[PDB]
Write a protein that binds this ligand. Structure first.
Ligand SMILES: *[C@H]1O[C@H](CO[C@H]2O[C@@H](C)[C@@H](O)[C@@H](O)[C@@H]2O)[C@@H](O[C@H]2O[C@H](CO)[C@@H](O[C@@H]3O[C@H](CO)[C@@H](O)[C@H](O)[C@@H]3O)[C@H](O)[C@H]2NC(C)=O)[C@H](O)[C@H]1NC(C)=O
Ligand SMILES: NC(=[NH2+])c1ccc(N)cc1
Lengths: 13, 263
């Protein structure tokens, strides 16, 4: 569950 | 946040709640906000750590929407709780006047990013200062009204307007107290603004045609909360990419910067 990847991403839900 | 409504779970997964941990009774108190940059760094305001610079006076809560005042009960997932490994206040910070109000915190152990926790984006070197007009939002667990002892248990959000600095600094407003590394956001008639407890928190923006939001500032100070012609003053993150990069590493910062995608 890295914290990298596209940022500013919301509702990861 | 004075004005605005509550937020919905997962609406702002980079929100971190900086708490003060009284050791003489295990109580945690939310005092500041913060921004999750990566698995191990959180961007916040410098003033927050006034008279509190021991890594053990703090506790960090991620993936939260509801925050309780002094509590001792552990936090159950997806909410996460963490310890401070480092406090890096900015080398040229100025206490009192609240200049270069920006700090970095290293977490330990690191947090796992999931449905309720992920990074935010910072500006690009190419960005320059926030140009108005624009649509921004601010979030936080601070006061709901000037003063009023209690903070907000439920994370709040509000839409605010960028104000030009020439206006923000004019006599009838802040009359000189503003600098180029700042950013003012709010309304001429007030009513909507950040407040104590929101400090360290983000000022996010984007254009109507744009996909993603971006942290263009960190809540810093202001004269009361939600007062006419006294907009909130924020720390513009753009001019600190510089410093951020020297602490967290180039690539780390690179990973929190949007590219040149479709418009
Ligand atoms: C707004 O905040 C500062 C206030 O400037 C004030 O002066 C007028 C412009 C007035 O209309 C009001 O807007 C406000 O009361 C301003 O800070 C400085 O302004 C000057 C230029 O930066 C400063 O320099 C003066 O120029 C020369 C430089 O060598 C010299 O005479 C002297 O040393 C001085 O530097 C001046 O000292 C500053 N003024 C004060 C009293 O703080 C800010 O730039 C404005 N904010 C922003 C973000 O630009
Ligand atoms: N937004 C404000 N006027 C404000 C925000 C934080 C704070 N500590 C004081 C004022």
């Amino acid at each position: 569950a890295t914290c990298d990847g596209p940022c500013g991403l919301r509702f990861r839900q | 946040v004075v004005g605005g409504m509550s937020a919905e779970p997962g609406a702002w997964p980079w929100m971190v709640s900086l708490q003060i941990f009284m050791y003489h009774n295990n109580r945690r108190y939310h005092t500041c906000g913060g921004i999750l940059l990566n698995s191990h760094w959180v961007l916040t305001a410098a003033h927050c750590f006034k008279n509190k610079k021991k890594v053990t006076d703090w506790r960090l809560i991620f993936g939260a929407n509801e925050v309780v005042w002094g509590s001792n009960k552990p936090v159950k997932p997806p909410l996460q709780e963490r310890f401070v490994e480092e406090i890096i206040i900015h080398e040229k910070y100025v206490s009192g006047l609240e200049i270069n109000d920006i700090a970095l915190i290293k977490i330990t152990p690191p947090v796992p990013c999931g449905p309720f926790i992920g990074p935010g984006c910072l500006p690009q070197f190419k960005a320059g200062p926030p140009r108005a007009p624009q649509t921004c939002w601010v979030t936080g667990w601070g006061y709901l009204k000037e003063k009023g002892p209690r903070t907000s248990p439920t994370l709040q959000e509000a839409r605010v307007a960028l104000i030009d600095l020439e206006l923000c600094n004019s006599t009838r407003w802040y009359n000189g107290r503003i600098r180029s590394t700042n950013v003012c956001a709010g309304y001429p008639r007030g009513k909507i603004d950040t407040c104590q407890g929101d400090s360290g928190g983000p000022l996010m923006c984007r254009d109507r045609a744009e996909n993603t939001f971006v942290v263009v500032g960190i809540t810093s100070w202001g004269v009361g909360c939600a007062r006419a012609k006294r907009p909130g003053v924020y720390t513009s993150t753009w001019p600190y990419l510089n410093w951020i990069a020297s602490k967290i590493g180039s690539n780390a910062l690179q990973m929190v910067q949007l590219g040149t995608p479709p418009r």
